[PDB]
Amino acid sequence: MRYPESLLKLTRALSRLPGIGPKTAQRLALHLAFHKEEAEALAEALEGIKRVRACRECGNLAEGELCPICQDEDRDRSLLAVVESVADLYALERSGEFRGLYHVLGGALNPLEGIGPKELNLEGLFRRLEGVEEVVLATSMTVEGEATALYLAEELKKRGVRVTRPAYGLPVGGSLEYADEVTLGRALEGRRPV
Amino acid sequence: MRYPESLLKLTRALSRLPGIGPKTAQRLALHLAFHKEEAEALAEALEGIKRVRACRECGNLAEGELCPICQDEDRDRSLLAVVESVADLYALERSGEFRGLYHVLGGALNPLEGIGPKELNLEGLFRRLEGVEEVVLATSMTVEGEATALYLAEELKKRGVRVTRPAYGLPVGGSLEYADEVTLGRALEGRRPV
Ligand SMILES: [Cl-]
Ligand SMILES: [Cl-]
Ligand SMILES: [Zn+2]
Ligand SMILES: [Zn+2]
């Protein structure tokens, strides 16, 4: 469709973003061209995020050295949560049921994609076990996240610390009829007294 | 969810974009933070589009003064296409069945939103009728675009030039069963010999 170079340069850059097809790229590029003020603000914010980097301790996004979680003094440092990504950390933190610390991996273990202990931010985890009561293995509830969990569990039980896994089960407001048979089966097996 | 300032500043700027909710804003903001090279390229392209502006004659997006269409010498200047937006011009131009010139309005007539002749790039149209055989009223096929068409038709027939409207009808690969009754009714009324 497009022909001006800076417009096409913008549309092409917008298309590199994940979950942004060429049709959305064009609509946004046109919009940015017709709203100079907004486009300048976005360029300012993009320059602004050059500073941001992985936290020295977590792997969580941080202004400068330490992330907001690590440099919070009101934090139960007896608790630690292993997590695959920053998006998952935010979800956990948004839940409100956790005031521990986090360790952010680079992803999950995956033999089929050659992803293993060296590729993940893993060796850093074992250096931070000082006065850590509990480690929550809060990896994804997938084949890959479960494989990661079992590996961390084996390695953590060796080094003398208890490990817990968040519950498989039904989601809140969920009907039994529309849940899958595996999730439903785990929910039954992990049923609790009341 | 988020707490670092430049990240939030980016996520907030990304949310100002049309058809971008806060969940997508966050995913993209995180992605840009973890891909410094790509983010710099987007900032470069955003700075790059400061130059872009409305064409002196069309209202179409242009590098500097004139749009690529207006400064193309192989252009049937006997033909002119009135259009509501640049997105529509590109669609028309992508169709391949038009080698005329374009006039880009700022939108369509809409009494309910106080949108009328002064608010649209309209007065500029009548200055460009020199050696113009045909004007294609290629506004949207809506209540607003039709109202715009009729107004331009009245005003153009006064100033001595024929006007045409693109066809209402069925789309290519379309079944009759799933088409709406109005579109189907127009397709029948505008049926052609073969
Ligand atoms: Cl798309
Ligand atoms: Cl969303
Ligand atoms: Zn941290
Ligand atoms: Zn032009």
Describe the structure.
The structure is a homodimer of 194-residue chains. With 194 residues, chain A is an alpha/beta fold. Chain A has a domain at 75-166: Dna Topoisomerase Vi A Subunit, Chain: A, domain 2 (3-Layer(aba) Sandwich), CATH 3.40.1360.10. The first copy, chain A, contains 6 helices and 6 strands. Chain A has helices at residues 5-15, 22-34, 36-48, 86-95, 143-158, 181-189; strands spanning 53-54, 61-62, 79-83, 101-104, 134-137, 162-164. In chain A, β5 (134-137), α5 (143-158) and β6 form a beta-alpha-beta unit. Chains A and B meet through α1, α2, α3, β2 and α4 of A and α1, α2, α3, β2 and α4 of B. Bound molecules: chloride ion (2 copies) and zinc ion (2 copies). The site of one zinc ion (ZN) has 8 residues of chain A, from loops. Chains A, B: This is Recombination protein RecR. Chains A, B: Keywords: DNA damage, DNA recombination, DNA repair, Metal-binding, Zinc, Zinc-finger.
The ligands found in this model are: chloride ion, zinc ion
- CA gyration radius of chain A, whole angstroms: 21 Å
Overall outline of chain A: globular
Structure class of chain A: alpha/beta
Fraction of residues in H or I helices of chain A: 25-40%
CATH-scheme architecture of the domain at 75-166 in chain A: 3-Layer(aba) Sandwich
Strand content of chain A: 5-15%
Number of strands of chain A: 6
| CATH fold description of the domain at 75-166 in chain A | Dna Topoisomerase Vi A Subunit, Chain: A, domain 2
The span between the termini of chain A is 63 Å
Total number of helices of chain A: 6
Order of SSEs of chain A: HHHEEEHEEHEH
Oligomer: homodimer
Sheet with the most strands, sense and barrel status of chain A: 4 strands, parallel
